[PDB]
Amino acid sequence: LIRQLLERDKTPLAILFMAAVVGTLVGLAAVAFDKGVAWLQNQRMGALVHTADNYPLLLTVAFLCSAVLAMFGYFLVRKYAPEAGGSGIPEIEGALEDQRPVRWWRVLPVKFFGGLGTLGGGMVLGREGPTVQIGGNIGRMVLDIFRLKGDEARHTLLATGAAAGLAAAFNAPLAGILFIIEEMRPQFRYTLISIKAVFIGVIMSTIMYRIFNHEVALIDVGKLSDAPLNTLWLYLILGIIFGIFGPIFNKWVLGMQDLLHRVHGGNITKWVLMGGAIGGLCGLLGFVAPATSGGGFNLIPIATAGNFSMGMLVFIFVARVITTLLCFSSGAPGGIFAPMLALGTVLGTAFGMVAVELFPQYHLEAGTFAIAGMGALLAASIRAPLTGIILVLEMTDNYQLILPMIITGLGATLLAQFTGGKPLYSAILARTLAKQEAEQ
């Protein structure tokens, strides 16, 4: 009696089956990207050990290999795909609506190969941007394979691919679910089946991630002490000092974009030569000191343990802000999410040392502010606290301090609105839509 009624409910089960195949296709193409970025990074620095007789020659070999990888990425991006260069999240936030197209023809080779080129070279970016853009474009690709002309299936499978990309870029299933409901809330349908397709995508993508990697947390810090009471106002003070800083590192990106848009003009023969020099200089800076340059997913346990002085922390913070403004605002095919975690961990440790020095009788531990700083800086700069305070907990497993994290996320997202500020993934989207409308 079920088989005759199954045809009456056929077309939602079609969307569920496409969500189940998206959760395999991305989640395989995410683990392939992660293994590709693990390759030719340790292989790149292992190609450096048999040439230690001439140290400037070693410097120039590191500079040239990072520069040719960045030039490969920028040449593969600035040809065949002007929509690939950037953080990826606005270019599908405008594609959940009918404002920006998802052209999977020439992005899914381009974003993957350019992300390998700009991430194995050692630039500051961190892969969730390419992983979510690849996920959304796979969610658009598989709807072209099995021909479906529904005007809601393409809005459902894009959100399913985005959720299943973010749930494999971070091993964060719950944050992969809530990223759609928080960051892409005005670009969503929620018609009682587009939460189920998102669930199937997140489940299958996390299964295909954990079937290859065996790690309980992407950032391996142990069980820190739980934050007691009568010391959560220090987390509120950290929230205030991040809410002041939030729009400052939201105006700086949009200023550095307009600054670096004129150093090359519009032709790719200057953009490639500028971005290759930027990526090579960042690779040399990563060889010289592997704390100022490099991706965001190093240095977070090293800082949250407390293995840094105050002057080293402020030098790492200044040079890290400079290099994450230089290596992302040039139209790079990488993400700005993980460098925000690096900046948050650095300033959280720099505040935790101060809070331990000033108040000894609170019995503090300077790692807890380093944990809360990422979930506050994401809330201050992208204006999405609910999918930040779980994205920094799904890969840390420090669930005991879950209340000061909400306190500092609230304190960041309040003073990010008291000061005139906007979400970065909406400011970039509105700016490129205004640029496209001014062009056409």
Add this chain to the structure above:
Amino acid sequence: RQLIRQLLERDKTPLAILFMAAVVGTLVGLAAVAFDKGVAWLQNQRMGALVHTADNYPLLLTVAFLCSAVLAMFGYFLVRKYAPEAGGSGIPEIEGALEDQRPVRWWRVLPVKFFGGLGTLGGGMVLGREGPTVQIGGNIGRMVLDIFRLKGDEARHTLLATGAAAGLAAAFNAPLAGILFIIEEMRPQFRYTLISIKAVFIGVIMSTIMYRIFNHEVALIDVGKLSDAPLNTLWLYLILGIIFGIFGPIFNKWVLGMQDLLHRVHGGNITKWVLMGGAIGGLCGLLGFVAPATSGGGFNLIPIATAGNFSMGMLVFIFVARVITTLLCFSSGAPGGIFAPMLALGTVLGTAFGMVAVELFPQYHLEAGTFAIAGMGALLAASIRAPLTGIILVLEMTDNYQLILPMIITGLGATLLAQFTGGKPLYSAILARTLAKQEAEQL
């Protein structure tokens, strides 16, 4: 200075909303702490009285029957008079008040939900403390807004939201599930304004602070670290998801039939209603001493059934004689929620399916107790259709965050087979029936 004075009075209208959200958070923190201390004192006093007068067995049976029936009649007569809307699940009468449907009364709801809702729950009925305090928060948000007469349109649907969120957060010690409840479950009712979503955060943290002041932070359920679920038994949670998805609309149709089946035993008058409900509360207080895991508050068995073990026949007896008493003690019209009895109904079927799976599948290295954590958030997601709240709510109070993937697996299965098989959310169907009654009593 003059520049910060000019910027201060320009934004005086959202800042007043945030300050009232802080006041609502502190008030529901004090109210829920007083509610938990009241029901704890009532349960401890009743058990101490029965232990003191436990000399002869028929006398001990009769005094334990008269207790939690005198309190039940005091919790029913004070509801059926002065407050015809209080005696329900608490939450749907403010889900129909996030809109403009139901009136948000604080005149005769707070001294009803904090007198009868204390008296019929501290006596030891099946219903949990989740239901009263969310309505207490949503009805004290209007009291906070009406003590200073702000009278804004965006203010009322913000202080009806932060009261519910902070009431849930002070109920189950869950500062994520409080926000996620009225982000996900209240999606057809709550309006995003980018200031209300800050006011809800303010209310949730300022109520969780006033809860963690009085109750020391360990857990609500005493299961520390169960075994993790590897990537070989993840399909086995999906079968329990299918089972709970079938049980989804099979449950809360018994509620739908019982709410109109117990309407014939008393009609509509107060005297036969309170005399039926006194016998119901006395039967439940008797079953809370004859076999003190079949009935009660619903939290006295979850560290027992999750960590330790019952027998299989004992577990199916607990499940059957718990289904037969949850409907009997809730659907009469009592002040109490179906979060905690739903969790108690989920953990027993989870432990029973775990004891089935550890015997029929020996070659999985299965710990049988870890399926009950999935079963709680599976029956909750199947009968309320709020999976994203139901995962994080049981994860806030069991602290087994090492298994978050089988939780989403069984929530997916439960929601999918509760949507394919024709079912409705219970907290929306109760609201639809009460709205139909309100529109039909006039015409």
